[PDB]
Design brief:
Chain B: Interacts with SRO7 and SRO77. Chain B: Belongs to the SNAP-25 family. Chain B: This is Protein transport protein SEC9. The structure is cut from a larger assembly and holds chains A and B. By secondary structure, chain A is mostly helical. Chain A is 59% helix and 0% strand. Chain A has helices spanning 17-20, 22-43. Chain B has one helix at residues 2-51. Chain B starts with a helix and ends with a helix. In chain B, 96% of the residues lie in helices and 0% in strands. Chain B is built from one helix and no strands. Classes of the chains: A mainly alpha, B mainly alpha. Chain A binds chain B through residues 18, 21-22, 25-26, 28-29, 32-33, 35-36, 39-40, 42-43, and chain B through 1, 4-5, 7-8, 11-12, 14-15, 18-19, 21-22, 25.
Chain lengths: 44, 52
Amino acid sequence: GQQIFSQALLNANRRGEAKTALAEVQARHQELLKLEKSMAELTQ
Amino acid sequence: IKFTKQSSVASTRNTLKMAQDAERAGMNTLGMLGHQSEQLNNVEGNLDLMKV
């Protein structure tokens, strides 16, 4: 005669996955902005 | 992350459009230069004839 609930922990691997690939997409975006700027000068 | 990717898409779209901008302008420049080089060839011939 008894019952029980249950809780959950996230995976360690995940860690700060919010920025694991955010930093990387931000870095690529910076590269793309540099590309865009250089192309703007070249077109001019 | 989604916003940054969208910004990257927009950036590459503009970069492509501008690259196409450069290309047309450059092709016109070469066309005009071929025509003007040729006018100058005509000039060169008359200068030779006038020398004679």
